[PDB]
Design a protein around this nucleic acid. Structure first.
Ligand SMILES: Nc1ccn([C@@H]2O[C@H](COP(=O)(O)OP(=O)(O)OP(=O)(O)O)[C@@H](O)[C@H]2O)c(=O)n1
Ligand SMILES: [Ca+2]
Ligand SMILES: [Ca+2]
Ligand SMILES: [Ca+2]
Ligand SMILES: [Ca+2]
Length: 341
DNA sequence: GGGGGAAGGAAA
DNA sequence: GGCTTTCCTTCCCCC
């Protein structure tokens, strides 16, 4: 394989500096306003002028404003970034039939029937970047390599607005020098567990006894890291069909009172069905986040499609099961639909 | 022993 | 804090 990875730059914030060009140069910060007080929520994304100062995905909208109090804070327009994204995706579908849409702003292209070497791959990349810049004035980064994992890593290294290749020789250099915590699919929890085992690089997984890896991070993530360490990782570029869709809302104030909860839940279901659009789900899950923020969720799977009426009736049953089996207060309430048809 | 599953992770 | 969507890793049902 010769994989080609695209990763739209500071995406949500770009798609904002593209419908109001006056923003370029100024720090922008797309936030998610939760709804329980002046500026409560978090930062979705922030253009690079804002990151230079500490504002990044995650930190509360309130820390953001303490750091860059005079920045352009805008609310999240997800339905809008979603379209811009698709339009771009469609642009990429021409450069190859084998495409995997990883996220709302990440796509893997398998161009192993579209080019011959990394020099051709690299040129196809630039061609792509440009096309995108031409049609939607959106810069994106490109990473090319022998599999999805190293193509992604490539882009991680080149973003923003770049292009790169980690040829067969580099891969071995990396399997040895790349901080394993920088490997796609390894976060803080698993990173720590691996640091405790002396595993700081990929190559470090071939030495540790296996079953003592399966023991600490999980059978799957273990297999994952090793195959990568053996330069034997090959996950095909497969079309991805969305598997779930949901919406959680945040209540104006905590409670365990079913009738105080009901309005928000029914409000989330509605919005949830608007999204589904033609998709019929056979499984519904009610999700609530206790005052302490842990995540409780009860579900049920049907042997047929779920009609709102059903979603309505059944979701109350579920919600109840939560209230009956958890004594904590609720602040967040929502739903989620799976097992489409 | 294991193939095929509802809930709480763990990462993006 | 912090959506939204993933895989998963357990605790089962039953071969
Ligand atoms: N905690 C996060 C991380 C990411 N995103 C969103 O996910 C998409 C891209 O992911 P990410 O790479 O994390 O954000 P970017 O702003 O695109 O940063 P960069 O260009 O450096 O990758 C963005 O459109 C945004 C989000 O809502 N919340
Ligand atoms: Ca991105
Ligand atoms: Ca991304
Ligand atoms: Ca990453
Ligand atoms: Ca990491």
């Amino acid at each position: 394989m010769i994989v080609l990875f695209v990763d739209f730059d500071y995406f949500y914030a770009q798609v904002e500096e593209v419908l109001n060009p006056s923003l370029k140069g100024k720090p922008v910060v797309v936030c998610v306003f939760s709804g329980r007080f002046e500026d409560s929520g978090a930062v979705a994304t922030a253009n690079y002028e804002a990151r230079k100062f500490g504002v990044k995905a995650g930190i509360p909208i309130v820390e953001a404003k303490k750091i860059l109090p005079n920045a352009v804070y805008l609310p999240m327009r997800k339905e809008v970034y979603q379209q811009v994204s698709s339009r771009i995706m469609n642009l990429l579908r021409e450069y190859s039939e084998k495409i995997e849409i990883a996220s709302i702003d990440e796509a893997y292209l398998d161009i192993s029937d579209k080019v011959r070497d990394y020099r051709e791959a690299y040129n196809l990349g630039l061609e792509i970047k440009n096309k995108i810049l031409e049609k939607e004035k959106i810069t994106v980064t490109v990473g090319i390599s022998k599999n999805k994992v190293f193509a992604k890593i490539a882009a991680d290294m080149a973003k923003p607005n770049g292009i790169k290749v980690i040829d067969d020789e580099e891969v071995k250099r990396l399997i040895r020098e790349l901080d394993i915590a920088d490997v796609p699919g390894i976060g803080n929890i698993t990173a720590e567990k691996l640091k405790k085992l002396g595993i700081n690089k990929l190559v470090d997984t071939l030495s540790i006894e296996f079953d003592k890896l399966k023991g600490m991070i999980g059978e799957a993530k273990a297999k994952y890291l090793i195959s990568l360490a053996r330069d034997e990782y090959n996950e095909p570029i497969r079309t991805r069909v969305r598997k779930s869709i949901g919406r959680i809302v945040t209540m104006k104030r905590n409670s365990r009172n079913l009738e105080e909860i009901k309005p928000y839940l029914f409000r989330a279901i509605e919005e949830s069905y608007y999204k589904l659009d033609k998709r019929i789900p056979k499984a519904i899950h009610v999700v609530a986040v206790t005052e302490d923020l842990d995540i409780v969720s009860r579900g049920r799977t049907f042997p047929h499609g779920i009609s709102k009426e059903t979603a309505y009736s059944e979701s109350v049953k579920l919600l109840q099961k939560i209230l009956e089996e958890d004594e904590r207060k609720i602040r967040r309430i929502g739903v989620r639909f799976s097992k489409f048809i």
